[PDB]
Every structure is written in structure tokens, then in C-alpha cells.
Amino acid sequence: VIERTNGPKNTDSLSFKTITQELLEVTRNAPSEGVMASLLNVEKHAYEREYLNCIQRGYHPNVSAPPVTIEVLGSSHVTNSINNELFDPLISQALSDIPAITQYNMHVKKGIPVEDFPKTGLFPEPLNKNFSSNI
Amino acid sequence: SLIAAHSHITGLGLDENLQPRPTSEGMVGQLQARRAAGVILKMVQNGTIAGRAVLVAGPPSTGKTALAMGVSQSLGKDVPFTAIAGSEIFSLELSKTEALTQAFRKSIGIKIKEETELIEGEVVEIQIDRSITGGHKQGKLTIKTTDMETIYELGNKMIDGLTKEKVLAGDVISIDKASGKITKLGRSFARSRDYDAMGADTRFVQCPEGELQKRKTVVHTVSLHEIDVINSRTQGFLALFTGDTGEIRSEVRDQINTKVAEWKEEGKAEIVPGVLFIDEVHMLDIECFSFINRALEDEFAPIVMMATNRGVSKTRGTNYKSPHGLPLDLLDRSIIITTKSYNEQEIKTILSIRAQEEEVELSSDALDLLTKTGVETSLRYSSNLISVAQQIAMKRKNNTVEVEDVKRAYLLFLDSARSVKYVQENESQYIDDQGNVQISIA
Amino acid sequence: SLSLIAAHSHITGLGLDENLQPRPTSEGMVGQLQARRAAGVILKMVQNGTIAGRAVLVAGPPSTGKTALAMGVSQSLGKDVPFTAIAGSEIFSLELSKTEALTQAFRKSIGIKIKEETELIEGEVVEIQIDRSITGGHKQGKLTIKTTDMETIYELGNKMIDGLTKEKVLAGDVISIDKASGKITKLGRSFARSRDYDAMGADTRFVQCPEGELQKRKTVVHTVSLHEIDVINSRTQGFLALFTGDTGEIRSEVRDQINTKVAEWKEEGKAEIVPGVLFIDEVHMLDIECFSFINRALEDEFAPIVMMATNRGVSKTRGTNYKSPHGLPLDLLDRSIIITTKSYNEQEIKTILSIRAQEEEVELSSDALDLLTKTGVETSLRYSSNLISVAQQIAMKRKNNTVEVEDVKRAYLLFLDSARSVKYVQENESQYIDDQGNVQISIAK
Amino acid sequence: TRTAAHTHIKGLGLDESGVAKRVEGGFVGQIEAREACGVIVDLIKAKKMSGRAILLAGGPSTGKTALALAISQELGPKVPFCPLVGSELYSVEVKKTETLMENFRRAIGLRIKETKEVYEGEVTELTPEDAENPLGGYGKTISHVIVGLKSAKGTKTLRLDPTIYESIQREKVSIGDVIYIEANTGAVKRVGRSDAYATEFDLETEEYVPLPKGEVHKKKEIVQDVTLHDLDVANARPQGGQDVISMMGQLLKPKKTEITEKLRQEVNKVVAKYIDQGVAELIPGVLFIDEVNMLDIEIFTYLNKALESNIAPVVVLASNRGMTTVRGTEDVISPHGVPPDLIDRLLIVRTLPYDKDEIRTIIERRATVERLQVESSALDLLATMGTETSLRYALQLLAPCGILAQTSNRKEIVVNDVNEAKLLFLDAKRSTKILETSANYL
Amino acid sequence: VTRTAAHTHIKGLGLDESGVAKRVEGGFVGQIEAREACGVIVDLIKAKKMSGRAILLAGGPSTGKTALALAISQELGPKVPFCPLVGSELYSVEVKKTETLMENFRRAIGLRIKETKEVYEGEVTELTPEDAENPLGGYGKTISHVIVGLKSAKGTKTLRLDPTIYESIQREKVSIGDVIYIEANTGAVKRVGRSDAYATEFDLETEEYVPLPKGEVHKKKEIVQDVTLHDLDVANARPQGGQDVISMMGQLLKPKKTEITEKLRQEVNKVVAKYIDQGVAELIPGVLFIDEVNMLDIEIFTYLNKALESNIAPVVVLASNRGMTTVRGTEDVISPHGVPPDLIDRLLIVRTLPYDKDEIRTIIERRATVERLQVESSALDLLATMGTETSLRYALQLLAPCGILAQTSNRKEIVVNDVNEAKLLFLDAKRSTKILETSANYL
């Protein structure tokens, strides 16, 4: 999922464009006051009609707990493997974002282009600001 | 949106003293049932009592669903009316009690007061600063009216709303602060230099005057089930549409109940109860009735209405027979409205109203023949014959249904009793209950 | 291929002439002249390919040759024609409806034919020089491919530069590039450079250096069933569903659009339709809902020829409470054509047993073959067929090559058929667990 | 070509403003059922009614499925038609109520007209023009982008917005490619390299589209046809986003889910809004449920609920049972296996068996459709055999007769050929006689 | 004014200080022996010593069974966990019924914990990261540290964070000029809002404006928390709230019930016993109330026999209204109240009795004066005779249509004619059965 690349495919193949993705890709950059744009934008209109971006949070959990620690006495390989699994840099980078000045540092001051940046900004957006945390 | 079965009923047809008129608002006859339903309607409109069960019983084709449609039509806007059939409870991803809990909680609305600020003006200059990968976005907006001019600040979603429906520094927009909606009213500057990267034909509006920022109060209604589904997990708003809300835990419902009482205490929100209508209630398990017996005693419970057309039939999930197919403990805590069968004058008035609904011209003799065949056979058959006779009469290039068209429609399309007789006369040609049939005609 | 000697592996086609007249003993089939002629008619109807949606039922007593006849039809049908063989118990799934499983079985048996032209350039990489412009928008590559006999130099586009800088080759890998289309593959590493790196690596393999011409021309004909297209056009990466079976109730819109595009491709001339046969062995244990779906599903032009086999008498159809002939409802039997098989005589049993003995490389005497024929007349046929194979091992333990009468008698004593087992149970019923669970384990009382 | 049990049936053969004649449209006999289906076809073409159900019943091999397919052929390919079997509603993913509702919504079509303005052609020049007064700390401030387009008999130079440049760089458009520029949004895309740029380079394996025809500026009026179920599954399935949940779900098995009533209500109201603007057009269709005796009583009760909806299509049902118990009950003897509450809501059309000459004409038409030549005496023997055993068994035996005739290098079908085919292939009665007179488990 | 629903005239058992019950007190009328037995049970629960004591309330319909359990819950107070239940709710489609029963068992044992928190808070003044030497090295993040300057009232601190804390901070979308709240127990960060030290009226994203937090930046505060054992079991079975990958992806996938193993419950018991041993926690056992216990089948009853004998189980209250019925899931077992005899041997049955005319009349009086209605005396006697003739609940539920019919005639008092009109318009079970028997086509 993380390093999925949308490469081009040759047309001479058995794969088609069914009507579902023939409707899906049109409304990616479509504006408002359109027919087919508004016929596929039911969810956003229902979001902004009911004033859902100024609502309050009603439920918070009672107990929050980290995953159960596994310990092996006298082996650094276990600690390295557990730290690699719990804090894997690819998925942790995918769920986070690089700071802007850091991006300017590695792109301009170091010459690294855009396409070999690590993938970032894949965390889902919460409903409000109020739903972003349990506190 | 189309001409349906109950499309001719708009209300209940009652006075201020709750006395039913003999023909009003598309309903004829049935004065006691209409009066009782009006009492139940006033009982819902007062909103001071909860968890009352009303049972509507009678023979088939009598007007139970018509009465429920009249109640829902006269209930008015923004009051919830959940109408389900009895067989929708049995699901593959939800237990019966969970589906019944969701159906109960869909019929209680919460009316929330909100404070918003409306900003309308003429756009002077837009500055948008984004990072290299386009993740972090911030900027400043300079908007103005004829009197004032202010420089604002923008966030991520404001910039995303400005990038869509692209504003070009001279368009007149209106912003709602609490809703976060961008509306482009039109273009007022009418700039001279235009490049051919745009094809819109934006209207000429005037620059607004007066105050730039105004204060407004808005009111919207949200049901309890939506609040539960939203607070259940991270992406519950999509599950409000996809139906992927699998067995919400009880702690969520307890905390939502406490929060709703807290909102009622502060004057922010108020509770508007509604009606849950369970049509064909005899198709329910014994466990559903056992759940309903205790779900009716809660504080947040709507007015439950059930309808059935069964006599002393077998209760589902058991091995005995009960009146109306419902067990006696549920029937103890319910109030029964009984409907009566129809006369011939009522049947003639019903057919005349249904003919006027379908926009069909009828003669006197055609209406009399339809009344006679609706007395002999069922009412619904003679009601169904009207559109078929209209099409047959339209085939002969005249827009008036005559007796010959009704006779042709009666000849072409069969009744229940005529079909039963034709089956019983030639029972070898049909597949029996033992699966035997003579296909050869010799 | 990977196979041992199966139950009927001696059968290679139906033994018919050019006039659809069955020879008495040819191509591994003995007897059953009318059934073999009927199966030849069905085979000709399949090979014509203009008739769709026909149901053929093969009915007979057990051990008569129904699935042997289906095996003969499957062998004489030829290659690249789809022949799906399922049992009746396979459609009762947990993650699939019976209707959907029957649709997937129906669409596996009709396919299309696609031919394509390949211009492969397979060789060993010598040296790749990557050159870029001052602006950098144009990229040229000096490719030095080499086979055993010769070596030439090509100029690569920027898309080849991008496709080779991913899964990078290291000047001595074996690659093949299609000239017409541009398919890029890395076959592995050459055997000549297998001694310089002192350790293998996680994702490498050693292939031989190709010989002959560098550029080769070849046409390939592909046969794709409709079910493959349905699985592929339903998801982002669908071949995993082709190999793991997690398709999960494909919708109807994709099937309708695939039918429309297959029809328009047949109109354009790119593809042509290859119909096939679906065989449902032991059809009697299907539900009544499956029978109704089979009734409605035979009326489409994209339907194969369905062959069913039943050995039931007048039994009870599953899902109901009545009885019907062959365990099938009467409206399905109306939509059907019945081929009847008949039980064998002594001569056919003798010839079948000699054929099965020749298949298993077992040498029988005349007296042993006569005794096995007598046993197969008295008992069933499969009992004698299994007695052959165990008598071979009994005679092999005796340091003898040919199976004699004594080995057959010893194999008859050591192994029982159904009748003697039924007698031995019925005369000693107190020691076996009954229907009520009553048993007497103690030997004294 | 390729024929399968049908395709000799083209329409109903009724003349205008009149009755059905004897042999027309591949139909022989069945005059009253054909006239009734013509009246139903006219009612569907009127496009006003909602939830009208008919049921056509008769013995096996009478022409119920033929009449339904004739209705679908007479309506045309613009009107939606959803064929179905009653056994298809039992799924293991969602409840049968949801499957029935999905098949209900699949039968209502929508016709949308739209105007598209586009720019396309080969790229001749691409220069981002520098600004007059650049800003400090930034490289290459752009004021406009000059793009030159060239197509067949046309060449036009465009001036674009500065913000099209990162979409140009994202699509990696170079000089010589073919682009596709929407008017209002920009939103370029690489169609492919021009086919005139294939020969200068030996190994360049991008696709090579031809140079597009006509001018670079064109206003094309497109018409797109969708159903309401397509809109429902487009709105429920979340749009192309960047969160890990959407990209996770795109690679997984597309599991069906219970679509809520809220999404259907919102889709209905936005469709009604755009219809009232005069842009869209609603096309109701036919849902055909075959072999309805396989349905359960829960599905029958939900059908009773759903037939009174506002947007239900015309439902056509077929059955061949007599007095049979309803599935899922114990003691409800009902005509055609259909419970009486559903029987009251529909009209019944009766289909009658045929005669000797009708069987002969049907056999003759099926022979002349399959491109076969039959002698007259063989036709008489086949008609007698079809009267003796079954019409369908006489129809199924034509192709083996043709094969046995072609084996003897003949074209005409001879009496000895049909004698040989009758000897080789049995029917139900002779096989039952073999079964009853044997004791070898056959 | 308020909303009334079938209850809420009941506030408690209405007992004396010595356990004797007044006849009309606490909203109860009659049922003296059952109220005294429930008071003894309430004292047994408040003793907080026993485990797995189970009673059963038996009697006919409309006799006061669920009212006694609700009165028990009101007498115990809100600090004791009370878990109402219906016997049909144990049949789930996600997990087996045994696990649902054990979850509802563990949901009825509470816990009060005095825990402490480590808090960094203040207004953000600076936000500067330091980059790594090799950003594309594959191992390790882009940044190495982030310098964060926090300013509170009479204080200013400078913090140096790892990328792990900064990832959650930037997930909270923290800018310069905001007031944040870093909790060091879990790494959770809450963005309180914009500071009020700057301008207010130039925003467009409906924020809130917060003063500077008092005290120092680093703090230690005590919070009293009330949790159950099931909360700990659920939070450990599906981990969320950490900053690792596993707990972060656990918040995004769809939640689902799972069969919690016995080992996890044993470990949670060990940790809770350790917390109690330090004098931090305190155990509060509660009540599990299973109404309509005849809906259970033999497997749940057989597991209930095992689950009552554990050393942690709460007090279970059951209710049933069957005489001698067959147990569900069996064919031949006929037992009193639909409860098998091995479970009946472990119970203590409390009998409930029917009412009389006087008790019905005063119950109707109490329900009328709760619902803010004014009833005449003759109408009261007519309703009492109606209640004895047909049902108590039918007489109770006819009060509001009578009030509506009185109000629609511009009147406040309920009179006899309103009761006669409500008799005409609305029916009961016996008259409906009488209509059903003498009818043509299955009315």
C-alpha cells in the first residue's frame, strides 16, 4: 500500500474501464455547479449541511494501553527486532509529515528531487479539531 | 416522486376538536380509527411521555398503512418517522437486539443551537503559501466591502475550499464560519486581461455594502443514532452511509446519554421525540418481543406503532398460537386500534379519489361497474384496473374510459378467485405439491 | 507430467470411426456401443460450436462407465478447449452463494482465443552507459546486449532508462526486451559470472547464457476463459484472486460489460469464441435452488454444454420432501436428454480386466483371469480390479513374476467384499455399536 | 452464428392500435397473453406509475420466459431490464432484503446530458514565461504559461494560468506529446506520444496515439446513462483519497455492505433537483423475477413493503405451481406458491398450452432458425412425437438429427434419422419406465 | 415539563432504619416482604465481602419485578456499577454467547484509582528541528531532534524531543502561538487553542482563545478515575493510545469483538491486586441484572453454573414469569420458571404477589399525580374497576388519552365521559381476542 506506484499500462490488454471508475476519475478535480460533479458529492454536501465541523465530542475511552511488552533476558537481538517492528521507519514516515524547512533543506541545499522523497501524509483526517485527541 | 399507492393522502383530515370529516385530505371513512390516530398525533406533538406502544389491527386492505402514512404526513417536518418492515431485523452482521436498538434510536432527534458568523464581500488579494510536497498550507486573504476592508488568515480546509470553485481576485464570495462553506455569488470587478485557461461565464453582481461580518444563529436536527455512529470510531461518518456500524458498545451509548442530558441542562440542545412504525409486526421472533418489552421502559423511547393483519396465528420461534401472532406480555403493555371493513359508498369514493390521483377520466357507468367488481372482488384489484383500462381506452384514440375498456381489462387480467378456479379445474398441467405434472397433451 | 496410475487412465478418447460407429475394443473402451455413439454425437455438437445451452444427463447403475464415458469425451475433445469437471458437493461454500458458485463454474467452461506477436531480444548485458543532456529532459542509453554467437548495440529511450533503473541490472544479468511492445524482464544472472561475488544474495538466480540469434520472432496463442476476465476486471490486483479463490460474489454490471465487449471484439475480429463442456459428476445432491438456477441459466448464448451423471433411482430430491426420478425435478428433466448405460456381461468384464491388467503391468494366467472374471460376475467389477493389484504384490512376495490361481485365492481370503462383510456383521451384531449405541464389549456373560 | 433456446423471438408482433396476429415476431398462438403484455408495455412506456406488479402463470413449456424476453425486446435497449432468478437472493455476504433492494434500484435509469469543452493536440512549444518583477528568495517566478497546440488542420497558441505548471510537471509532459486540457479546471493529462515520433528513435515503447482530428477547440455534447444503483455505490464507496484506509480497501476484496436509507434519500433528492433544472431524465424499467416459488415468506413480506415505495419499477413474476405450500411456512396452501397478501397486490395473466399444428409450426420455425432443412414427413413425425412426449423434447432433438444427417453426407433430414435419434436419446417417461422396472439401484 | 416513562415514580425501597417497610413510601405500594428481602440483599451488596450470590424474582406479569431491581439500583447509588440486561442480548453474531456473558460479568466490578500524571504545558514560542546527516539512508528519520520552547505563567522551559513525540505534535497540527498540553504518561498531545496574547478577530476557522496556563510548565497532578475490569481487558486486548505503529493502526481499523483469553484476565487481576496492595486502588463490586431469564438456553445456564463459582463474580439478579415451562434448547426438561434445577439449587427465590382494588386505585393516583394530571373521584373509581376487570397496565396507559380528550374540550379535570370515550376508541387484549374469534377473514 505504501510504495504503490501508478505506472502506465498498455492499452492492448484484457483490462477495461468499467463505469464505476469511469465515474470516479472525472470528479477528482471537478468544480462545483456541475451535474456529474454534484451527483457524486452527496457526502460532502451532507457534511456541510448539518454543521458537522462545529460539533462537540461526546465519547472518550476509559483506559488506553500500549501493546504488551515481550522481554527476553540477555539478548540484544530481541530488543533490536522489537524496536524495528514497533517503530518501523517506513510506516512511521507514512503516517507523519516532514517539516517544510527540512524539505527545503534536502531539496534545494542538497539537490534531492521530489520523486525520491519518502512518502508522507497518509494519516486520515479527523472529523473536527475536537475529535483529534482523547483529552 | 412518482404516482404511488398512498400518494393521495396528505394528512389525516381532522378538525380542531379532533373530529374526523367524512372526506378530507384524501381519507374517507374509518372515523374511530382516524380519531384515535389524531389523539396519538397530539400525544406525539406534546412530547411529554415516552415508550407507548400502539397496535393497529384489522383485515387486509383496510387502511392501516394508509393511516400510518396520514400520521406521518400530518406529523410535519424535522420530526423523525422511522418506517421499517418486520423482516429487516434479521441480518448477517448485526444481532436482532442491536438492529432493534438502532431502529429505536433513529426515531429520537436532537435539536442543537449553533452560533455562526457570515462574511460576504469582494476579494482583493489571495496569498497562499504551501510546502514543496503540498502538505502544509497557510495564507492570508484580503476581502473588502464598500465601507470596510480586512485581512484574514486561512487554514488547511479554507485553502482547500478556495482552490476548488476557483476564485480570481474580484469575485464576490460568502463564507459561513461555522459550516465552512464557500459560495461564489459572482464577479464584480470585470477585469480586462483574461487568459484562455477558463471557460466559465460568471455573472455580474454588485459589490456588497454595510458590515463585512454579521452574527447569525442556526438550528439543525441530528438523530441520536448519528451521534452514536459518529462517536463510535475514527471514521464513523462514512459508516453513517455504508452501514458498517457493527455492534456499538454500551459504554458509547451511556456516555452519549449523559452528554445529551448535559446539553439539555445548559440550554444548548433540546429533545424532539418521534414515531417508530413497524409494519407487518408478526414476522418477528420471540426474542425481539422480549427485547421490546424492556426497551419500551427506557427514558429515550419513541412512540412505537405496529400493524398486523393476522388472527390467532402461530408466534414465530415458539410452538403455540397467540392472538395477532404476539405474546400476551407484549399485548398487556399495548393499546389496540381496530379498523373495520368498507361499505360500497366508501369503495366508490376511494375509487374516485384514486382515479383523480392517476389523472384518469371516468364515466358514471364505468365507475359503477368498478364499484360492483370492487365489492365482489377485493378493493385493490379494482383500483389496479384503472390504469390498465386507461391505456386500453387510449389505444382506441379517445381519452375517456368506457364500459368496454373495463370489460376488456376484466377479461385480460385475472382475479385471485378466477385464477384459483382455473388452477383447480386443470390441476394436472401444474406442478403439484408432490412434484407431479403431465407435460404431454396426449 | 506428474501422475501415477489412476482409476481410469487407460482411456484415451472414444473408440469411434469416421461414421461415428464404435469399434468393439479400441482406445481403451470396451462395449457400450449406443452410449459411445451418443457421446460421439455430443462431441460433434461441441466441435461445431454454434449451439449453446444443452443439458445431457448420463444415467445408469453404479460401476457401468458414466465417468469413464466423460473421461473419454474429455480426452477426445482435444487441447485448448475448456473442460470443467466438478462434483455436486463443491458448490456448498461458506464465503460464496450457491448461485454465485454455479455462475463461476458456468463461466469457467467458455473461453476466447487471443493471438499475439513477440519480437524478443534476449541476451546478456555487457555494458550500459547512461548519458543525460544538459537540460536533463532527454536521456540516451548505450545498451550492449550479447548472446553466445554475436553482439550488437542499441539506443534506449527514456522509458527504458526508467524501467531499467528500477530492478537495476549490473552488467552481466540476462534480460529480454520485446521490440514491439516493450516488456522488460530480468531472467537472472549468467553462469559465467557465478564465481566472482563469493555469496549468492537474497533475490538472485543463475540462468544459462542464451545462444543463437539475438532477435527472434514467435507468435503465441492464448486461451482465456470468461471467469478470468471477470476476476481481473473486478479489483486492482486480481490475479491473486485467480490463484487463491477469494473473488467473493462479483457484481453483475462487470459481467454485462464483459459480455458486451467480448461480443464487440468478436465483431472486430480480434478474438474468437471457444466453447467447452461442463461436467457435474454426482449431480443428485444439489439443492432445489441450484436446480432452478440451472433451469434459468441454460437459456443464454454464453453457456456451455452441461453433462450430468447420476446413479440414483427414484430418490428424494434434497431441499424438498417428495421423490422424483434420478433425484431431479421434472422441469429440469424436461430440459434434458438422457443417455442410458447398461450393465456388462462376462466377455466385456473379461476384456476390461485384461485391459486394466495390461495398464498396471501385471501378468495374469488364463486360469487367474477366468477366476477374476467369475468373481467380477458374482461381485462387482471394482472388487476384481483391486484384487488384481493386491494379487500382484502377493505373487511378488512369493518370488514369482506371473499371477497364478493361488495368489488370487489368497487375495480373496485376505480381503472381503460387501456381501461377506454384511453377512459377518449380521451374524455377530451384538459386538458392533447399533443405532441406539448398545454394544457388548465383554466377551463372557 | 450462435443460438440458444431463444433468439427466434423478436418482439410481440402486435400491430399498432390493435390485436396480435397469428404468426408474428417468432410467436405462434398465445393471443390473450400477448395482448396483455402489449398493454403492460404501453403502461411502462407511459412512465408515470410506480410499483405495478404482474404475475404470469401456467404450466411448464408455455412461454412465460419467452413473453418476458419479448417485453424486454419490445421496450428497447435504452430502458433498463434486470433479469433475475428467485434463488439469487440468498447470499452469504448481506441479508436478502438488501439484495432485493439493490435489484430494485438497479432497474431505474437516468439520462444525463452535458456539454464538454476541451483542448487537445500535439505540443509544439511549452515555455513558462518569467515575471517582470521577480521576488527575492525565489527562483523562476511565473506570470503565465505559453502552450502551443497543434492538431489536424489546426494550430492555436494558448495562454494559461501560472498554477498549471505543477500539473504539467506532475504529468511529466514534454514537447511532442498529446495532451487533453479541460476548459474550466485545466487538469492536463498525457494521452501519449505522437505517432510521428516513433521512427526517430529505435527503442521507444510508450504508446503512440494518432494525431487528433478537427480543431483544438470543440464543444461536444455527451450523453451518459447510469442507474440509481451506480450512483448509490459510487457515493457509498469513498472517493479517491490519500488516507491509508482507502488504499488498503482498494487492494482488498470488495465486500458488499448494507446501504442505509439516508444515502438513498440524499441521492433521490439531488436527482430530483437536477431533474427539475431540465438537465436529467428519469427512465423507469422492468425487474423480472423468474421462478418466484423459491422465495421465502420474509422476502414476500419485504416485497409487500417495498412495492408501496415512491420509486419502485414494474415487477414481472412467473411461476408454474398449483396449490403449493409457501416456502418457510408449514400449512399455508396458496395458489402458485405465492402468499395471498402479495396475490392481492398484482394482476394475473394466464398462459394456455398449444395444439398439434402450433407445435408443428414452432418446430418448423426452430428448424428454419438453426439453418436446418427438414423433410415434411420427418416434420410430421416430429410433431407427433412432440405431442406424445413434450414440446421441449421435440425441440432438443433437432441438432442430433442434423448431426446424424451430416454424418451420411446429406442435407435433408430423413425419417430414419429422427428414428435413430429417438432410439439413441430418451425422454423423461421412458427413463422413468426403465427406473421402475429394474432393481440394480437404477 | 419533564418526560415520564413507565417508572421514575419509584425512588427507593422506602424502608425504615430497622429494615421494616412503610406501606406507601418511596413510590411503592404494598409488596412488603419483597421490599424487605431486597433491602437485605442491598445490605449484603454494601457489605462488599461476598462473591457470586444470586437471587431470583418470580411472579406474574404486572406484579412489580423490574421495579424492585430499579429500586435496588437507586438505593445503591451511582458509585456502584449496575449493568441492566435482557436475556435476548446474549445472542451475538460477532462472538459466542459465553464470551458475551463473561464480558457482562466483568463489566459489573468497578475500581476507583488515584493516579498521577506528568504534564508539560504552556504556550509554544519556538519550533526548530535539526536535520539528520543522511536523510535517504533508509534507517532513521529525517530529523534528529526538535527544540520546543514553552512559556507558562511565571515560567519558561525549553524542551528537546525525539521525532516520536514531534510526530504526535505535528499530528495535532501545532503552530507558533498555540497552547498545548503534553501528557508524559502516554505521549498524548492536546492542542488547547490559540493564545489570547495576540489579536482575536482575524481568524476564519472558529478557534477558541485560551489564557496562559498558571503554575510551572512541569507539573504533577492527581486524578481520581473510576473504571471497570472489562475496560482494562478491552484496552489490553485491542491496544490503542501508544505512539508505536501497532497502536496507531489500531485506531483506524474497524473494531470487532474477540474471545478474550483467560491469561489476559489473570494478568489484569495480578496488576489490579498489585495496585490495591500499594493502597492506590479500591475494589467496588456491583450488580448484574438479567431480566427475562427464560430466553436463555441450556448452554448459557450450564456456563452460568461455572461462572457463579469463580472468586470474582458480582451479585446476579434474575427475573421470570413462567409457571412450569420447558427450558429452551431441550425437549423434555420441565422446570419451574424456565430455570433448570441445578441452577435453581444455587438461587434464593423471592416471591412477588398480585395486588387488590385499593392498591390499584392508589397506584393509579400516584401515576396520575406524577404525570401532572387532575382526576375526579368518580373517574378514579371507574378506572379502578376497569383495572381490576382487565389489567393494571391497561388502566395505567389510558390516563394520557383521557387527559388529551379533556384538554381538547378546553377543560382541566378528567371526568367519566373522557374515560368512556377512551374505552370506545382504544381496546384491550380480551376485547381484541373477542373480535378476533368472531370475524370473517383473519382480522
Ligand SMILES: Nc1ncnc2c1ncn2[C@@H]1O[C@H](COP(=O)(O)OP(=O)(O)O)[C@@H](O)[C@H]1O
Ligand atoms: N380511508 C382511506 N383513505 C384512502 N385510501 C385508503 C383508505 N383505506 C384504504 N385505502 C387504500 O387501501 C390500501 C391500504 O390497504 P392496506 O395497506 O392493506 O391496509 P392494512 O395494511 O392496514 O390492511 C391503499 O391502497 C390505500 O390507498
Ligand SMILES: Nc1ncnc2c1ncn2[C@@H]1O[C@H](COP(=O)(O)OP(=O)(O)O)[C@@H](O)[C@H]1O
Ligand atoms: N466401457 C468401459 N471400458 C473400459 N473400462 C470401463 C468401462 N466402463 C467402466 N469401466 C471401468 O469401470 C470402473 C468404474 O466405472 P465408472 O466409470 O466409475 O462407472 P460409474 O461412474 O457408473 O461408477 C472404472 O475404473 C472404469 O475404468
Ligand SMILES: Nc1ncnc2c1ncn2[C@@H]1O[C@H](COP(=O)(O)OP(=O)(O)O)[C@@H](O)[C@H]1O
Ligand atoms: N408461442 C410461442 N412461439 C414460439 N416459441 C415458443 C412459444 N411458446 C414457447 N416457445 C418456445 O418454447 C421454449 C420453452 O418455453 P419457456 O418459455 O422456456 O417455458 P416456461 O414458460 O415454462 O419457461 C422456448 O425456447 C420458446 O422459444
Ligand SMILES: Nc1ncnc2c1ncn2[C@@H]1O[C@H](COP(=O)(O)OP(=O)(O)O)[C@@H](O)[C@H]1O
Ligand atoms: N408496588 C408498586 N408501586 C407502584 N407501581 C408499581 C408497583 N408494582 C408495579 N408497579 C408498576 O407496574 C408495572 C409493572 O411492570 P414491571 O414491574 O416493570 O414488570 P412486570 O410487568 O413483569 O411486573 C410497572 O410499570 C410499575 O411502574
